[PDB]
Design a binder for these strands. Structure first.
Ligand SMILES: [Cl-]
Ligand SMILES: [Cl-]
Ligand SMILES: [Mg+2]
Ligand SMILES: [Mg+2]
Ligand SMILES: [Mg+2]
Ligand SMILES: [Mg+2]
Lengths: 106, 134, 96, 197, 171, 188
RNA sequence: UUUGCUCCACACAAUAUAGAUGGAUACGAAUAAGGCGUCCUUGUGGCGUCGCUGAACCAUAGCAGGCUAGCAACGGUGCACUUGGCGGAAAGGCCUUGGGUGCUUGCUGGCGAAUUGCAAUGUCAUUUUGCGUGGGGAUAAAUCAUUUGUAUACGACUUAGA
RNA sequence: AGAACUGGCGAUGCGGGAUGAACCGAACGUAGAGUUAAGGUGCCGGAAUACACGCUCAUCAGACACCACAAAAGGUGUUAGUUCAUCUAGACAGGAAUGAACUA
RNA sequence: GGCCAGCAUCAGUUUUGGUGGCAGGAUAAAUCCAUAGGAAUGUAGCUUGCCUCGGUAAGUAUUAUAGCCUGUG
């Protein structure tokens, strides 16, 4: 069909932070269609991949991935906390991320 | 030539007015107004839906077009007899507002296989409707 | 502390900056308001300054001391050969 | 959800709309605002006119071209309120501001597109009836905005064209609805109703 | 908080000279029993020569509304301290229970007179049994026969930032 | 104290027709028609019959209720304007210099001119609003009569004529010169 | 200044992404009021109906989507053309005529898939520029130096010279 | 400017009070996870454009301790309250309430 | 057997849901049921005066062709 998507769209908002200090080890992720911590419990533990492009090809590809996972919810409006093997770069605040359906509990 | 004044059709807060609860433990259930406390508080009781007799804020309910005769301060047993006689449940289920609620519930209960059947049926209906247009 | 005596400011602040003009031909930044009930005519003309001279004429000014009396005035002469129309330009109104 | 969201600024409170748009820009959403001359500000006209005069008298003493710049257009007034809610001196702030466009009226690129509203910032839903409010178009004119009549004339022409489009679309919708109505009560139609569609 | 009504019965400590001291009772509106017992000694020390170190709490019991689903017109007498002086006031509150009327009273006193909890004494709460004994016009207007009123300018709650239609305020 | 409900009654005579929709009020009578925009009060109009109209306010405060009676007065003035009309009479008051008042037509604008007020050489011109007719009554010395269907139009036009003849740099208690309204009433 | 410049189609390289992953889906006005349908004497008209969110509507099945057969309709849609009209606020878009051609899941069939080994974005988008092809199009100026004084500290400015 | 008791700064970073030696919270080896303090949750800015009852419209509103100021005296602005008198035996203005004096 | 990962079964710490059995109080208070008394923001009935042949208006009337309140069980 015209669509082949098997993930949920998400946005990288910022790092975990106080008013003046941030923590790059934890990133805040907004998931489309989730506006409640109760709904956000469904996505706990799901894998997150950030997909970006580079001019140089290394292992037969010009596309690179940063992998992560949803750890816990955040606030009252459906935001969740995520952790990646390497911390997401700060320039990606406002960029799209992919939330997959595995590992699956359904 | 007669005077023409446009009339408003507000739903009035009154004894016997049927309301729909949108927040709390009794969300989605019907209840009747028994007595008015103040500008923002009324006493409601829906026995058929299992709504306990309680004093509730007017910001927690939605007024409905339905209304039935009911004495002021009527008790739960009296409300039940009046509610059944007026057939409030049957009149509510015949409105497009209630059907829209029922349809919304049916949409979310569909399975993946049933959603596939909906697409097949929709395409078949589309073929007939498009043909009739031309 | 306040200046001891008050005097008016030297110069006019509405003619700043005192810089060289962008072009030798000065720009007409405003035209007379159009009256659509009149025949088409020009609103400006081009000429070259030649010099000044002196004239004598009678004064027609009731109530003046020099009424009905000759006065001497200075004038400026502008050489104005006819101009040639070589095109037209249209403008439209825009929120900018 | 749309790649570009077009907001109709008519009937919106400037401050509450500005906070909503600023958050959207920082999240990576492109926003276009049209009809900025129809924005509303809470409070009577004289109060807001007085407030702008207080803004007008602030400037660098030794050089007026260095101090705060006072933009008179309704679109730029909304821009000023929006830029104050964004860290515009950073690269992240600059990138966010590039996702925003504000116009007076509805320019041709967006007059055939869909316009949405923001209920959180709607004046009719927020202000209690009887409270005084000011229209941004009138306020801008009193402080030196020159193009109020030009925008009004262009908007009148656009509405005439839009009305003709709606009349044609409405007639087509009536014919389509009748086709669906006569296609009901069939075997396919009954099955769709059982499944919710 | 959500007030509850208690009865607190107290006595002076028994002595060899004076056995079986008199029992004193009062009704207290408070959030919990710890606050209720604190309030009991606060008012007792204003009426009798006694304090906690020379007294004992005999019984504390929660008092429930006899008819928690009946609309009642309550008459409330209060004494409160303003920024300069003390005043007595009478107010009328229409609700279904005493605890609900008292909670409304504290909100009303704080809103209209800036009176905190520490500055207010509740002299008496009673139910106005008969109509025509109501002497405040903001309560009499709800006692009219066949009362009806609309709710103009309905404002609906939106769960989404953007709306694709101009909202209506009909009701 | 947020009164639950307040109402006012408007009486409609036999020959008057009133059309109200979206707070736009139009009255039609034998003498003419009048209109008024009232989208600034937030009231509700209801029709009882062809002879009675009620206007109400629901859950309104002291200030909001006070405007309910004003709306009744404005509509009543519209009704009696188109069935009876308004007539304002003014008198010329002077001590030494006679005041000459005439009607002039300047570029089709129907002004009224005042001459020789306190011996002034200045010419005083007052515009005449639409719907107001000016006639100089006979058998009465120094009187001008203004008539119309709108009370606001007639009263404001007469007020403009009075304000234009104010004395300056003099003790106004002694210099009682001017044109003052002397009677307010109805044409019929 | 050694066959340069420009537009068109694809051929290969390099370059980069503030961040495609079914569709930005077009009346205006009012909100103490409106939308839609219908009727008449066409109005500030009568009657019916709707709201209480887009939780919608459209689209959506096939090797990221193959190779073939038949039935019922004469519809739906893509591409390249073509008729006409409209759009100047930044129009660079919208609508329409005609035929050609591919697909059609509206219905019924027949073959193909594996081994990427139990997951690894598993690569399917658009930004710019350069080097080779061939199908067309077009054959200039500015500056220095000299000169002028309506100009001028120097630059700049204003004039002239095959 | 000079004393008393205690806690502090000096000798001390860290979270909060925009900013500050002394205030609030809490005192410090290198890291991970969880929970909090004081302070906050429209946007800048991490976190409810949360819920509930009222009050306020300012042609110089207001917005949080230390702290970065405002008074006496006034207002038929609006809100609640105290006392007294008139009023069903029709008051007040010219058919249901009204008058006066005070309080915050 | 060096680098990076997936799943299952456990241990330590912690976070967020579903669900079961008991205890206490005025052995919750209510609702509900039975019974006695009472009233009005007075239901039926009845009288009265105008009323576009039934609609109000005010007197009587305490459950009747609506109901409610209080006590006790
Ligand atoms: Cl100057
Ligand atoms: Cl030079
Ligand atoms: Mg200027
Ligand atoms: Mg030292
Ligand atoms: Mg500070
Ligand atoms: Mg935030």
């Amino acid at each position: 069909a015209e669509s082949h998507r098997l993930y949920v769209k998400g946005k990288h908002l910022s790092y975990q932070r106080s008013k003046r200090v941030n923590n790059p080890n934890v990133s805040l992720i907004k998931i489309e269609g989730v506006a409640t911590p109760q709904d956000a419990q469904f996505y706990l533990g799901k894998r997150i991949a950030y997909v970006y492009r580079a001019s140089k090809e290394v292992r037969g590809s010009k596309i690179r991935v940063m992998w992560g996972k949803v750890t816990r919810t955040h606030g009252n409006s459906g935001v969740v906390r995520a952790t990646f093997r390497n911390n997401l770069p700060a320039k990606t605040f406002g960029a799209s991320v992919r939330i997959f359906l595995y590992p699956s509990n359904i | 030539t007669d005077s023409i004044v446009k009339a408003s059709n507000w739903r009035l807060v009154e004894v016997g007015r049927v309301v729909l609860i949108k927040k709390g433990q009794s969300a989605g259930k019907l209840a009747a107004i028994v007595e008015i406390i103040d500008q923002k508080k009324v006493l409601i009781d829906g026995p058929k839906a299992g709504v306990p007799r309680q004093a509730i804020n007017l910001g927690q309910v939605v007024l409905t077009p339905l209304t039935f005769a009911l004495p002021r301060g009527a008790r739960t047993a009296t409300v039940s007899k009046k509610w059944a006689a007026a057939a409030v449940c049957e009149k509510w289920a015949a409105s497009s507002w209630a059907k829209k609620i029922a349809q919304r519930e049916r949409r979310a209960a569909l399975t993946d296989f049933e959603r596939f059947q909906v697409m097949v049926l929709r395409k078949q209906k589309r073929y007939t409707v498009k043909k009739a247009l031309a | 502390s306040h200046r001891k005596y008050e005097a008016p400011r030297h110069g006019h602040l509405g003619f700043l900056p005192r810089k060289r003009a962008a072009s030798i031909r000065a720009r007409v930044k405003a035209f007379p308001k159009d009256d659509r009930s009149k025949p088409v005519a020009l609103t400006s003309f081009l000429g070259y300054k030649a010099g000044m001279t002196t004239i004598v004429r009678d004064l027609d000014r009731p109530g003046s001391k020099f009424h009905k009396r000759e006065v001497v005035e200075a004038v400026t002469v502008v050489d104005t050969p006819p101009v040639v129309v070589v095109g037209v330009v249209g403008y439209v109104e825009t929120p900018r | 959800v749309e790649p570009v969201v077009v907001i109709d600024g008519k009937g919106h409170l400037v401050g509450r709309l500005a906070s909503v748009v600023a958050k959207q820009l920082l999240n990576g959403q492109k926003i276009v605002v049209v009809r900025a001359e129809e924005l509303n500000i809470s409070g009577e006209f004289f109060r807001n006119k007085l407030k702008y005069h207080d803004f007008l008298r602030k400037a660098t003493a030794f050089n007026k071209t260095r101090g705060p710049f006072h933009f008179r257009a309704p679109s730029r007034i909304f821009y000023k309120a929006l830029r104050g809610m964004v860290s515009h001196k950073t690269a992240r702030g600059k990138a966010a501001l590039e996702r925003l466009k504000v116009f007076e009226g509805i320019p041709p690129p967006y007059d055939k597109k869909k316009r949405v509203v923001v209920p959180q910032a709607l004046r009719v839903l927020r202000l209690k009836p009887g409270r005084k409010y000011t229209t941004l178009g009138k306020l801008s004119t009193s402080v030196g905005w020159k193009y109020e009549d030009v925008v009004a004339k262009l908007e009148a022409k656009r509405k005439v064209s839009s009305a003709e489009y709606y009349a044609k679309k409405r007639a087509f919708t009536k014919k389509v609805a009748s086709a669906n109505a006569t296609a009901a009560e069939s075997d396919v139609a009954k099955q769709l109703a059982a499944l919710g569609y | 908080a959500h007030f509850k009504e208690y009865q607190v019965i107290g006595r002076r400590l028994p002595t060899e000279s004076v056995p079986e001291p008199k029992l004193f009772r009062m009704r207290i509106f408070a959030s919990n029993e710890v606050i209720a017992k604190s309030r009991y000694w606060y008012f007792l020390q204003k009426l009798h020569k006694v304090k906690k170190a020379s007294g004992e709490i005999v019984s504390i019991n929660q008092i429930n509304e006899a008819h928690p689903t009946k609309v009642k017109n309550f008459g409330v007498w209060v004494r409160y301290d303003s920024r300069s002086g003390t005043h007595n006031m009478y107010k009328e509150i229409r609700d279904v229970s005493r605890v609900a009327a008292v909670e409304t009273l504290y909100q009303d006193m704080a809103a209209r007179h800036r009176a905190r909890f520490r500055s207010i004494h509740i002299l008496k709460v009673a139910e106005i049994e008969k109509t025509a004994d109501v002497k405040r016009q903001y309560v009499k207007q709800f006692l009219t026969k066949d009362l009806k009123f609309p709710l103009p300018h309905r404002v609906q709650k939106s769960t989404k930032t953007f709306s694709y239609k101009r909202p209506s305020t009909f009701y | 104290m947020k009164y639950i409900q307040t109402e006012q009654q408007i009486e409609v005579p036999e020959g008057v027709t009133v059309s109200i929709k979206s707070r736009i009020v139009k009255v039609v009578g034998p003498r003419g028609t009048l209109t008024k925009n009232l989208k600034h009060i937030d009231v509700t109009f209801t029709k009882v019959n062809n002879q009675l109209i009620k206007v109400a306010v629901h859950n309104g405060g002291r200030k909001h209720v006070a405007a309910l009676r004003t709306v009744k007065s404005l509509v009543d003035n519209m009704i009696t304007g188109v069935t009876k009309g308004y007539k304002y009479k003014m008198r010329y008051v002077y001590a030494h210099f006679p005041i000459n008042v005439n009607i002039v037509e300047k570029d089709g604008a129907k002004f009224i001119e005042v001459r020789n007020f306190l011996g002034d050489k200045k010419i005083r011109n007052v515009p005449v609003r639409d719907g107001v007719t000016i006639e100089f009554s006979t058998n009465v010395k120094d009187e001008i009569v203004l008539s119309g269907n709108s009370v606001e139009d007639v009263s404001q036009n007469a007020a403009d004529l009075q304000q234009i003849c104010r004395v300056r740099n003099k003790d106004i208690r002694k210099f009682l010169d001017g044109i003052y309204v002397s009677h307010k009433g109805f044409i019929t």
